[PDB]
């Protein structure tokens, strides 16, 4: 299909809340090899967030049921086999995204903004893999997530303003990674607090095009801090 046609179909699928269709359109766009625009990048990100999101949500429900079934072996086995089926789908989606990032997105990113965006995305999808991983391969997955987030973190501090939504969004997810994956509440709190305070000190740098996204992420950073310090 034509690139502009595939993008229009993806926008229609988004409005119809048909995220498998939306992701399939954006995966085909990415595979054409040309660098994605800001709009295309966001459509690909939204599509896969919803596709993977449904599995993460289902995984949490089924794991909670499996744990609360402590005592009934056969019934627990059913919830365990269902959790494993969900994990397989989740891993296939993450591997799909991570393959797009390594083959097309990260090598062709020609600006700091898009490079930070894709490295944060790499951090996120390895973090989702880390949530359902165990023991030995978990360590490697956790390392891949941390390395992607760290490189994105260094570029953003050097090239972007403290109020930039991508810089803020990265600090939000990297702090979530320290809290939830590395079990480091103090490093998570320190990362989130620094990001919030540096953005608060430079509110004059907010733009009309992105002040809504920036302020929303700042609110999420402070919500996490409140939760993690209670």
């Amino acid at each position: 299909m034509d690139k502009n046609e595939l993008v229009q179909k993806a926008k229609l699928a988004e409005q119809a809340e048909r995220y498998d269709d939306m992701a399939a359109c954006m995966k085909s766009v990415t595979e054409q090899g040309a660098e994605l625009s800001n709009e295309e990048r966001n459509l690909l990100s939204v599509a896969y967030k919803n596709v993977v999101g449904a599995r993460r949500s289902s995984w949490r429900v089924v794991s909670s049921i499996e744990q609360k079934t402590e005592g009934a072996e056969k019934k627990q086995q059913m919830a365990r086999e269902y959790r494993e089926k969900i994990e397989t789908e989740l891993r296939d989606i993450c591997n799909d995204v991570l393959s797009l990032l390594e083959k097309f997105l990260i090598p062709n990113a020609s600006q700091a903004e898009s490079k930070v965006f894709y490295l944060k995305m790499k951090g996120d999808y390895y973090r989702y893999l880390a949530e359902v991983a165990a023991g030995d391969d978990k360590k490697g997955i956790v390392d891949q997530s941390q390395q992607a987030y760290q490189e994105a973190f260094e570029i953003s501090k050097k090239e972007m303003q403290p109020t930039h939504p991508i810089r803020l969004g990265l600090a939000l997810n990297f702090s979530v990674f320290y809290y939830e994956i590395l079990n480091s509440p103090e490093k998570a709190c320190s990362l989130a607090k620094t990001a919030f305070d540096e953005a608060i000190a430079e509110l004059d740098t907010l733009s009309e095009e992105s002040y809504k996204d920036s302020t929303l992420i700042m609110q999420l950073l402070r919500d996490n801090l409140t939760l993690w310090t209670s």
Binding site: V46, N173, V176, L220, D223, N224
Partner: peptide, 5 residues
Amino acid sequence: SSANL
């Protein structure tokens, strides 16, 4: 709780 679209 992470990034909101």
